[PDB]
Design a protein around this ligand. Structure first.
Ligand SMILES: [Cl-]
Length: 183
């Protein structure tokens, strides 16, 4: 439900090469339209696995990249990966989540992401195999401080979710390279 202001801010930074835009939507056609407008990561999160995997398959047919899929269950992520998803988002917002990362690593996945509101959780996931660390802490004030800590720890691919362009901009300044906006 993001306003156009959120996309507007990430678009300006994306054009300057200062960020990648990740876009989440429940409709693959909306994801395709976003890809054509310059979105770099398309997040499928349909809870129905049949629909979600169908959305991954259709985005692959369209040539869209990079396709992401989000789940709390490594098995769903592994199926999405087989069907065309490149970025596998372990959702730790309701936790164990670290074990999902470990199993995906055992399966051979090398573009694992992890979504959490706590930098210490994200740091552990990073050590265990997650390469994209998603700070999603809209219920926590100044969550870009979590970005700052992960940046000092040496993580190279930090993403940040907010519906407010001001928060997105500050997270970029603190070291986020992927900004997540929503339909
Ligand atoms: Cl600053």
């Amino acid at each position: 439900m993001d306003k156009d202001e959120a996309w507007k801010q990430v678009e300006q930074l994306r054009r300057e090469g200062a960020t990648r835009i990740a876009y989440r939507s429940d409709d693959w056609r909306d994801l395709k339209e976003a890809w054509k407008k310059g979105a770099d990561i398309l997040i499928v999160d349909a809870t129905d696995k049949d629909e979600a995997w169908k959305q991954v398959e259709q985005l692959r047919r369209e040539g869209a990249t990079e396709i992401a899929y989000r789940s709390d269950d490594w098995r769903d992520l592994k199926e999405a990966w087989k069907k065309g998803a490149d970025i596998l988002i372990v959702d730790a917002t309701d936790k164990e989540a670290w074990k999902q990362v470990e199993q995906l690593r055992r399966e051979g996945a090398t573009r694992i992401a992890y979504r959490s509101d706590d930098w210490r959780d994200l740091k552990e996931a990073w050590k265990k195999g997650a390469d994209i660390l998603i700070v999603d802490a809209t219920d926590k004030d100044e969550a870009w401080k979590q970005v700052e800590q992960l940046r000092r720890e040496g993580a190279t691919e930090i993403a940040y979710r907010s519906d407010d362009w001001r928060d997105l901009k500050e997270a970029w300044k603190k070291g986020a390279d992927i900004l997540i906006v929503d339909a």
